[PDB]
Amino acid sequence: EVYANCPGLLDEVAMGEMEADVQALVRRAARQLAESGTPSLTAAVLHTIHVLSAYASIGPLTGVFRETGALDLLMHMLCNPEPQIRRSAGKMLQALAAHDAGSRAHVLLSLSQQHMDFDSRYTLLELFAETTSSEEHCMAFEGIHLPQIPGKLLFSLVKRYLCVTSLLDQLN
Amino acid sequence: PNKTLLLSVLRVITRLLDFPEAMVLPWHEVLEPCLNCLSDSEIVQELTCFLHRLASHKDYAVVLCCLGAKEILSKVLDKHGCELRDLVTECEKYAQLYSNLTSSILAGCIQMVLGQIEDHRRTHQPINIPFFD
Question: Which residues in chain A are closer than 8 Å to B100, comparing Cβ atoms?
Fold first, then answer.
């Protein structure tokens, strides 16, 4: 079909090396996170997280990025009391999102399993907005009356759709 | 219904508001029409009373503020509440978030449906998914 419609559209050693290096960096970052009782190591961890995001800026290496098991470390980082670092990690995850959806789905899904706090539900909603910055959710409004639903209903709908998208990608 | 009939109905609603699961039902039934009507002196008093009763599910009052009839509230106040005007009004982060989320859910569901239609076009097997029709 590509041959018929658009044929024209048709060195990973460094990629895998950076993946392993990011694995070591995440190990050091978790070491700092366990040591996150002094603001010097906290600042160093913030710098490490910036480096981790820059590593995440690559397109095709998402397979390695999940392969190194960075997801659980990132999830733990989201449960850290470092608010600025939490925001930075959220930005990094959002930058990761464009590459693939399944990573986002699994990340938020595991993030759910922690009458939760309205602040906690707010955190889930903010992360989902960061996700919904995706092109798949990028579409036009109906220009018509979209009735407003309640909040806990919004939580239920978000959880449902997240699992849906996860599985739908998973069937591939 | 009518001013007297709606007055008796409002009396019943205000009395039964004492439930702990009064919101377990679809409590967001006519809040929007209530804000639209919010009138007769009994009607305005009852709308204010219902709002004050709802002032305590904070997210429910947040949805009320998302409805955002603050201008009508000001007009009705000038015609003759305050706690809701303090708490619910001037908290709109919730509002923008929830609006964006609702639109996003709609768009995503639609895209999923269309994609499945195309996939079944490819496979030729008939579509059979619960409640899809």
Answer: 129, 132
Nearest residue to A87 via CA among A126, A128, A114, A117: A126
Q: Taking CB atoms and an 8 Å cutoff, what residues of chain B touch A126?
A: 97
Structure tokens at A5: 């419609």
Look up residue A122 and give its DSSP letter: H
Measured distance CA(B103)–CA(B100) in Å, rounded: 5
Alpha carbons A102 and A82: distance in angstroms, whole number: 26
Q: What is the resolution of this structure in A?
A: 4.1
**Sequence-ordered list of residues with C-beta below 8 angstroms from that of A115, at least 6 positions apart, any chain:** none
Whole-number Å distance between alpha carbons of B31 and A103: 39
Three-class HEC string of B16-33: HCCCCCCCCCCCCCCHHH
Q: How far apart are the first and last CA of chain B?
A: 36
Q: Report CA A169 to chain centroid distance, whole Å.
A: 16
DSSP states of A3-54: HHH-STT--HHHHHHHHHHHHHHHHHHHHHHHTTTSHHHHHHHHHHHHHHHH
What single string gives the DSSP state of each residue in B48-116? HHHHHHHT--HHHHHHHHHH--HHHHHHHHHH--HHHHHHTTT--HHHHHHHHHHHHHHHHHHHHHHHH
Q: Which residues in chain B have their CB less than 8 angstroms from residue A149's CB?
A: 28, 98, 102
Q: Do B101 and A132 touch (CB under 8 A)?
A: yes
In one letter, which amino acid is A49?
I
Distances (CA, A) of A24 to A11, A15, A64: 21, 14, 13
Q: How far apart, in whole angstroms, are the C-alpha atoms of residue B43 and residue A103?
A: 53
Whether residue A95 contacts residue A59, with contact meaning beta carbons closer than 8 Å, is answered with no
CA A87 to chain centre: 12
